[PDB]
């Protein structure tokens, strides 16, 4: 078992 | 039009027109869309008067200019943005959230998104001054379809920017007062703020197992299965994301998912003709079948198998070796009859073809699988038959070829195998 298009960090 | 020197001398002067007009102008001049001196007018010291207008409440139009401003100054690189807090920005912003004035509200709402989006600390920073209990009491009117135009698309943002980040992850304290609204938000019917919040819980099941039972507790998981199910993407990809990291956890929140229903998009997932929503879900099934027998069986029973055998057989890379750790967990932890029925499927053909591959990642996972699947033979006295399974299918010649591999596991992997079955 194991870990591994995201909203803007900024706008405007 | 102004130049800095002009702007400076308007917002120096005590004349609240001129000060409006120079700030205004820093606005238009900072919103131009090509080369935006926003470092000019850092140096030029104007970031504390900005602050400063914002709460001149008998001047609602320089109070929105100097938002304006101020939030396009902390859209761009961390050290303005520095700037801006520095300036006491953040305590204004968060007064300002109560302006009786709505688009005021807005853009501080916005400007401590922007603040909070760009890093753990400034987050910490905004959470410390007490903003989300006002940005919260903007949606706390049960209907949230009575908030005005784009108000809760904004505060959903702002609110995933909050929930973001990590290397300190958000205050559990923090989390656990706003979780409850996600919940309310991933049950809206706009795409955008569907999209914010799973995202925003995304990123709140990126950690521990302890912030994954936070949120599976405030009980997400059927709703992040239906809209797996969404036919807009920009919903799938971050609900596929926090299901796959809910499944990285304990036993009991992979089986929360299953119980959810999730098993049964997967089918859709793992042929989505998107790459990245298949490598997603072959990863969240590696880490399904690497669970318990039952959840293995589970996922026999909801027909994944061929699907897996599929992407390993005709996918990337990418999701071919998602798919090779996938089926090396399923035979590590399965039972007999389980590997069995995996055989059954066709996994012999793919698990050889991809041993030409330059990973040796992928070399050693997929030799390690061969090894679980002989051992089931053994235990079932047929290896003699899948030895001669993997010659039809060209193996020997790969696993013998892997003899001359310069790392010494695929190596000597590859020669117990050759010495205990092909020899």
């Given at each position: 078992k194991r870990s591994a298009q995201a909203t803007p960090p900024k706008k405007k | 039009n102004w130049s800095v020197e002009d702007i400076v001398k308007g917002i120096n002067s005590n004349n609240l027109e001129s000060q409006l007009q120079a700030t205004q102008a820093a606005r238009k001049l900072l919103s131009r869309e090509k080369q935006p001196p926003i470092d000019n007018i850092i140096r030029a010291g104007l970031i504390p008067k900005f602050v400063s207008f914002l709460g001149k409440t008998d001047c609602s139009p320089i109070q929105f200019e100097s938002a304006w401003a101020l939030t396009n100054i902390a859209s761009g690189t961390s050290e303005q943005t520095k700037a801006v807090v520095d300036g006491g920005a953040i305590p204004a912003f968060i007064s300002l959230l109560?302006?009786?004035?709505a688009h005021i509200s807005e853009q501080a709402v916005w400007a401590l998104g922007n603040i909070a989006g760009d890093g753990s600390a400034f987050r910490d920073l905004v959470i410390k001054h007490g903003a989300i209990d006002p940005l919260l009491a903007l949606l706390?009117?049960?209907?949230?379809?009575?908030?005005?135009?784009?108000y809760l698309r904004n505060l959903t943002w702002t609110l995933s920017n909050l929930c973001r980040n990590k290397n300190p992850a958000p205050p559990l304290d923090a989390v656990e007062q706003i979780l409850p609204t996600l919940v309310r938000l991933l049950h809206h019917n706009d795409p955008e703020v569907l999209a914010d919040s799973c995202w925003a819980i995304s990123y709140l099941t990126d950690g521990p197992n302890e912030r994954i039972e936070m949120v599976v507790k405030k009980g997400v998981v059927p709703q992040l299965v239906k809209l797996?199910?969404?036919?807009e993407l920009p919903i799938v990809t971050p609900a596929l994301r926090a299901i796959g990291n809910i499944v990285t956890g304990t036993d009991e929140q992979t089986q929360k998912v299953i119980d959810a229903g999730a098993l049964a998009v997967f089918p859709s997932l793992l042929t989505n003709p998107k790459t990245n929503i298949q490598k997603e879900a072959t990863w969240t099934m590696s880490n399904i079948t690497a669970g318990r027998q039952d959840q293995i069986q589970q996922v026999v029973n909801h027909g994944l198998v061929p699907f897996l055998v599929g992407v390993l057989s005709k996918a990337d890379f990418k999701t071919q070796k998602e798919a090779a750790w996938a089926i090396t967990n399923y035979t590590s932890g399965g039972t007999v009859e389980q590997i069995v029925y995996l055989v059954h499927c066709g996994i012999i053909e793919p698990l050889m073809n991809l041993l030409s591959a330059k990973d040796t990642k992928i070399i050693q996972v997929i030799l390690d699988a061969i090894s679980n699947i002989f051992q089931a033979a053994e235990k079932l006295g047929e290896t003699e038959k899948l030895s001669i399974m993997i010659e039809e299918c060209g193996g020997l010649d790969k696993i013998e070829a892997l003899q001359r591999h310069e790392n010494e596991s695929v190596y000597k992997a590859s020669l117990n195998l050759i010495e205990k079955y092909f020899s």
């Open positions: - | 109560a302006s009786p004035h706390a009117v049960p209907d949230l379809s009575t908030l005005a135009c784009g797996l199910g969404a036919t």
